[PDB]
Ligand binder design. Structure first.
Ligand SMILES: Nc1ncnc2c1ncn2[C@@H]1O[C@H](COP(=O)(O)OP(=O)(O)OP(O)(O)=S)[C@@H](O)[C@H]1O
Ligand SMILES: Nc1ncnc2c1ncn2[C@@H]1O[C@H](COP(=O)(O)OP(=O)(O)OP(O)(O)=S)[C@@H](O)[C@H]1O
Ligand SMILES: [Mg+2]
Lengths: 242, 242
């Protein structure tokens, strides 16, 4: 309940209150999986967590610091949270290596040799050291998404956010990215993963949160949630998804 | 030999000669379509035009300025050349309006409302003003790629490069992207378009360059190159694609 703390979170886009009061508390090293239909506020939720969107009411605490406290450095938090999106993760005009090294050099003021040493180490980890000097256009979707992960890991964050990282990919490219994320969980990374891939959720997630219409409607262990859902809306959603 | 001027352009990656003597001279307002097999150097070529890659031998002159002359402001050339890639054109972490205004604000130091009025009219022209405050991942491929053109146009370039802008799109999304590109061609923009979209090439294209193995093997008017190719490599390539 220590790494991410969310109390009565609400958000509105004028008329549409997209997050209608949500509560979640994520411990250090916990993999939490977010599921639910389109328009639930799943991405908005992740954005608030990543300081990409401000909220209308409630509280967000990350690593024991408040996002709306006057004294708190938001830029310092920004670099402790990583985020991988469904698309557009890479700079197409830069090599794979320079994608990864850009922020660690620009933000954390690392020297080139140091940053590239760690970038090659992460490319090794994802199975793409042989693509260091390649351009994003040369990469398949599964390879591009694995570079996005490596990009995010180079800042060495405390939390990794994943917004449907495999949703835009062909089925032959999905498990590629899921195994990197799977491996990332095995190394004690606090992860929030928005996904429709339920086999990942059950295999990897510590808790599953079912979001619908701006609420977290049901939550709990993957086995508990998938096998024995209690809420009609959870049942309805699970009757048509993977 | 006005807008783009290339003489015996050569580029290697190690012992791999990727461009082997490119000579091409693009007039102002000319729309050049580039076609050819994978590994032809089409993307490398466009990168050289866009100052994203250095070259081993030869000369490149964008609008009367030599990219290797001593007194050359490279950044001032960079800002007059726009580029749309196959994928990764957008920042997923910021809104559509912000994607477009980022560069004119940083590079041209425009105030926010100035840049935004320009972005809004650009979104209008590509038929997407309603998506101004939306995030990239809410967009279709067709939409995303139109915003990618809007981003590029916000810098007010005189050269627009397109590296397979519709390749990674579902076929129904291909149409409305080529409509924007056509409008851009019809308005006098100097365009280099790497594309295997024949209808586009025939309609708004002035010339077609057939690249293969680091050379421009054959060139000419689209009708002429498409319907009566002179070189057997061009014929063979046309037979397997169109
Ligand atoms: N920047 C924005 N401006 C206005 N409305 C928005 C914005 N972002 C999201 N919305 C609204 O919020 C809903 C989208 O939900 P999201 O917050 O994107 O979460 P989500 O559940 O991931 O959505 P999907 O489509 O399932 S991935 C839509 O109905 C939008 O109208
Ligand atoms: N940064 C790099 N390092 C090493 N090799 C490269 C690099 N960039 C390109 N190449 C190689 O150069 C050759 C031609 O590159 P491109 O310009 O991408 O060709 P292309 O015609 O665009 O091919 P595609 O895949 O149809 S877009 C390919 O064999 C690449 O493997
Ligand atoms: Mg979403």
């Amino acid at each position: 309940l220590q790494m991410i703390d969310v109390h009565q979170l609400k958000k509105s886009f004028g008329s549409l209150e997209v997050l209608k009061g949500i509560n979640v508390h994520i411990r250090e090293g916990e993999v939490v999986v977010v599921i639910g239909p389109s328009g639930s506020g799943k991405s908005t939720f992740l954005r608030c967590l990543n300081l990409l969107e401000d909220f209308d009411e409630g509280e967000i605490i990350i690593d024991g610091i408040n996002l709306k406290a006057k004294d708190t450095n938001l830029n310092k938090v920004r670099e402790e949270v990583g985020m991988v999106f469904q698309r557009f993760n890479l700079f197409p005009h830069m090599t794979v290596l320079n994608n990864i090294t850009l922020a660690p050099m620009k933000v954390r003021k690392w020297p080139r040799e140091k940053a590239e040493a760690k970038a090659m180490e992460l490319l090794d980890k994802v199975g793409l050291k042989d693509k260091a000097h390649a351009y994003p256009d040369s990469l398949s979707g599964g390879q591009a998404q694995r570079v996005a992960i490596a990009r995010a890991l180079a800042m060495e964050p405390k939390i990794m956010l994943f917004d449907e990282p495999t949703s835009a990919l062909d089925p032959e490219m999905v498990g590629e990215v899921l195994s990197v994320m799977k491996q990332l969980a095995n190394e004690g990374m606090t992860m929030v993963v928005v996904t429709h891939e339920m086999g990942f959720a059950r295999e990897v997630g510590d808790r599953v949160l079912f979001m619908d219409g701006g609420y977290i409607i049901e939550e709990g262990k993957p086995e508990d949630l998938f096998d024995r859902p209690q809420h009609e809306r959870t049942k309805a959603f699970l009757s048509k998804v993977f």
